[PDB]
Amino acid sequence: ENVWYSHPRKFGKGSRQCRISGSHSGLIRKYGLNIDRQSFREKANDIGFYKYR
Amino acid sequence: AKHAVVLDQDKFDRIMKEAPTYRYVSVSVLVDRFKLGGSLARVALRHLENEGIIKPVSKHSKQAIYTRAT
Amino acid sequence: PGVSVRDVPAQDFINNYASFLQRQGKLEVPGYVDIVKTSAGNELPPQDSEGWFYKRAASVARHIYLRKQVGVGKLNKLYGGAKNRGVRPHKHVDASGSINRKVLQSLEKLGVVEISPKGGRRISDNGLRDLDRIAAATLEDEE
Amino acid sequence: GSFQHILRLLNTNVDGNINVVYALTTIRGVGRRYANLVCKKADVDLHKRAGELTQEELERIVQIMQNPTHYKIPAWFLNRQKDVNDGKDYHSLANNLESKLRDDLERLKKIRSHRGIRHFWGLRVRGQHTKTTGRRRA
Amino acid sequence: RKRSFKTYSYKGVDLEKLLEMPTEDFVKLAPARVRRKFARGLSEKPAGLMKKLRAAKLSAPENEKPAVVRTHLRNMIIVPEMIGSVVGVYNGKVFNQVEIRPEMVGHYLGEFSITYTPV
RNA sequence: ACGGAGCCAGCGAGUACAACCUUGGCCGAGAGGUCUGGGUAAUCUUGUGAAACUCCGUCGUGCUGGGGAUAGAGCAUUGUA
């Protein structure tokens, strides 16, 4: 409704986000995952990652 | 500066006097007498390789050993 | 016999090639000679001053002979080396582009380099003659 | 031999013996790569000691030191450029340069800016962290 | 009589021309930062502010200072159209006054106030 | 240390709904401008011919050409800034 209600958020840390909740810190963007490093340890083997060595 | 680097014509007389008949001839040897210090000794040694006089052994930059021509 | 470039040592090859060019003086000069740093990171200019370019142009020609097709950006990366970027670790960045480009532009008109397909610069027929003649001349110097 | 040791050039000292460039670096303005650029115009050997020179070479060099755009320089190997309103460039290489910087520093103090305020107290200007650097001050 | 002090300006000849050379002519005679900034699109940067600065000199009481044009936009460079008016620079604690001059040219509004209280 | 000359690795990574890695060619003393591609990747960047090193020259034991901090002016680029 109001005119000014945004910023150029097409880059940096504020615009980027995870899939689960939306944390702006500790973000894995490798291979287009977008799941933060706390939840990645929980969901490693379901995706297919394993601790071989 | 500890002297013996400035170019003098009086010294150039005594370089040719003390050139022949020596075991050790190099950049390491001539600077011990307080002759042309550092690089000007290399230029002084470069004169003595042209017209015989003193013949070489090693041919490296920083390791330039020579010996008298028997 | 088997007269090739590889029998002559690579460092000794350029010495005979440099003197060959300075007799003629027909390899051409760009204009940036001795107003030059040489690379993107290099405190002192060229110590050789006179000659200099003829050493550079010879070493570019022999590398174009061995390989299929060499370019400008790769030659800058090959000649270029280390830096001293303040109080940090030493990095690697390309050398001067304007020097190595005008080597390739001038050698085309003299009669060495040729325009190849896809991308890069290969060798002419008359370019292989002058490479072998100086290689044969260097073979006579050794033997 | 031993022709002259100091040997002045625009009031500043130019010590005898040594070299072309590294004796000229004594001038408050000339450096380790400018004197080579100046020596290139006159065409003199860097191999020589340079304090023992011909008389014409000193006067030929000083003309190149004063005038930048006349002699063969690209006009981007200069110390200072652009001063006053809308126009030209110029530099200096003697006691002129040290005096020029003090007058040019007063311009920053007169306009009174973030640099000029910092220059009054003797603190770090270029956005450094002053929680460590230089435990002495001046 | 002619020269009082000296010309207060950028790099070269004389002052007089600066008063009647809006922005585009001023940008030509400037360093790398002002040229690159003004080359890009300035929308609501000199739009809202300049209408007050020009209108203040109409409303001024002849010879004395015009009214203070307060500024959140302290990223603006001092172009020579408004040499004479005062501007209020926002640190946080009140809009602080800055008197613009032809000496103060080619500089930002923020640097004539400073936001930390010691020195 | 400062010059040329010689010239060799392995782990990786990488856009099509975005703006990724980007050779080859021109402009430039640099940084970087631009025309073009190729690559969804033992296919194109890429042989990621990376450094330290090798070998002839320039300096030689002097806060020195070692060392690079503080400083000033401008030329570039990423960005609403």
From Swiss-Prot, chain A:
Keyword presence, ATP-binding: no
Pfam families xrefs: Ribosomal_S14
One annotated GO biological process: cytoplasmic translation
GO CC annotation: cytosolic small ribosomal subunit
Gene3D superfamilies hit by this protein: 30s Ribosomal Protein S14, Chain N
InterPro entries referenced in this protein's UniProt entry, alphabetically: Ribosomal_uS14, RIbosomal_uS14_euk_arc, Ribosomal_uS14_sf
GO molecular function, one term: zinc ion binding
Source organism, top-level taxon: Eukaryota
Keywords linked to the UniProt accession: Ribonucleoprotein, Ribosomal protein
Family: Belongs to the universal ribosomal protein uS14 family.
Name of the protein in its database record: Small ribosomal subunit protein uS14
Provenance organism: Kluyveromyces lactis (strain ATCC 8585 / CBS 2359 / DSM 70799 / NBRC 1267 / NRRL Y-1140 / WM37) (Yeast)
Gene: RPS29
